[PDB]
């Protein structure tokens, strides 16, 4: 069900964030040619105070990746079907809290759109954790969204049947009649 | 003797169902056409013994068809178009004219084949002379008839020519050609 898809997608995204974060030394911040050639930290290099920050982010992303892999291959039977209810807390709440931080990120004026390997998996895994809160919140049967598909398909079918019988050709004309 | 229980002095060769319908009752093994309604031998038997004509008809046409002639394949569903053209899309008059022309052509072909067979018997009688060296100018009527009825494979006539040219022995003949089965592949043909 969409629980498995949720967790395995968090696996893929976190492991790719690791494979792209622990294999490259660092990206480079744009120089913004002519931006206060003196102070204001412009036209410089990234500092040794953020590479370790990136590695710490990557390590946390890996720990939550392995945690998601464990939960996924454990609750694949959805041995303990109900114990994870504890770690459920840990797996979701903080995630949402994570997003909150990033949701206040534009307020603090921190730029997240320029760099790739830092805030991408940030917002990805945070939103995916909120979405796992959803998967546990409304309990998609993996056959209920298919039921919504069928509902909208039936509605549109009833629309096109009316459109046909009213503006194209009468159903009494097209279909064969019997008894004579 | 791989057979554990029973092993007669002659080894068992498996038998399998036939794959084609036999020659009718009326046709000769040769190339000449038949009498086209009634065979000539029908006249020398009792009236109460010639039910085999119509019985053979009933058999080849409806009753014993070998389940290998009812295989549905991709080749047979196009041969169906060809045959249905010939049987439903052509008027019987043109069919009749083509029939007459084909009969005439086949008669001429048979005459040619008979002449060729006679020439072959001369040549082989001539070569057996060099072969055995001495007196025998003879051939075998067996081989002439077997050549006229297409009962020898080419390898057989080659081996026979060699055997004649080397040892004579004009009465030592290849065993016989066996009947060709109906080729099948898969859903293909």
């Amino acid at each position: 069900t969409v629980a498995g898809l949720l967790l395995t997608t968090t696996i893929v995204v976190s492991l790719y964030g690791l494979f792209a974060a622990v294999f490259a030394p660092a990206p480079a911040l744009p120089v913004a040619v002519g931006a206060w050639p003196g102070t204001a930290a412009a036209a410089a290099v990234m500092d040794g105070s953020a590479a370790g920050l990136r590695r710490l982010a990557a390590g946390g992303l890996l720990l939550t990746a392995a945690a998601s892999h464990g939960l996924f291959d454990f609750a694949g039977s959805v041995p303990n079907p109900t114990i994870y209810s504890l770690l459920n807390l840990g797996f979701v709440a903080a995630a949402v809290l994570q997003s909150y931080f990033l949701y206040i990120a534009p307020a603090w004026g921190v730029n997240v759109n320029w760099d790739t390997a830092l805030w991408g998996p940030m917002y990805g895994t945070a939103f995916l954790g909120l979405v796992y809160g959803l998967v546990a919140l409304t309990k998609f049967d993996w056959s209920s969204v298919v039921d919504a598909v069928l509902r909208v398909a039936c509605w549109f079918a009833e629309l096109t049947m009316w459109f046909w019988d009213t503006f194209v050709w009468k159903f009494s004309w097209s279909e064969k009649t019997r008894r004579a | 003797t791989s057979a554990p229980f029973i092993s007669p002095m002659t080894p068992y060769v498996p038998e399998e169902e036939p794959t084609r319908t036999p020659p009718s009752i009326k046709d000769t093994g040769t190339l000449r056409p038949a009498s086209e309604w009634y065979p000539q031998w029908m006249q020398y038997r009792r009236r109460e013994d010639n039910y085999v004509f119509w019985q053979d008809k009933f058999m080849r046409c409806s009753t014993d068809i070998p389940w290998a002639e009812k295989r549905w394949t991709l080749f047979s569903t196009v041969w169906y178009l060809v045959q249905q053209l010939r049987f439903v899309g052509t008027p019987p008059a043109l069919r009749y004219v083509a029939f007459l022309g084909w009969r005439a052509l086949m008669f001429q072909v048979y005459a040619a084949h008979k002449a060729l067979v006679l020439w072959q018997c001369k040549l082989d009688a001539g070569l057996a002379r060099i072969g055995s060296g001495g007196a025998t100018a003879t051939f075998s009527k067996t081989m002439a008839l077997r050549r006229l009825h297409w009962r020898n494979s080419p390898l057989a006539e080659a081996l026979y020519a060699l055997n004649l040219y080397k040892t004579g022995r004009v009465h030592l003949l290849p065993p016989v050609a066996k009947p060709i089965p109906r080729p099948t592949f898969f859903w293909l043909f």
Partner: protein, 68 residues
């Protein structure tokens, strides 16, 4: 013009060489009556008792019997 007419004439001659149904066996995917093949049978309404009368002369109209 002669060639473009000779084509039609050859086709017409070929259709003439047929002359009938002699040589044509029966067929079960194609009966001779369209009503059997098309499953057409009258119902209950539209049934006039003296309509059968009309039926007869219509037959008599086409079976060519000038009595009518």
């Amino acid at each position: 013009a002669a060639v473009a007419a000779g084509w039609h004439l050859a086709s017409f001659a070929l259709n003439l060489a047929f002359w009938g149904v002699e040589g044509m066996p029966p067929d079960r995917y194609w009966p001779t009556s369209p009503r059997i093949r098309l499953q057409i049978r009258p119902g209950r309404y539209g049934n006039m008792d003296g309509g059968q009368r009309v039926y007869m002369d219509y037959l008599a109209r086409s079976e060519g019997v000038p009595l009518n």
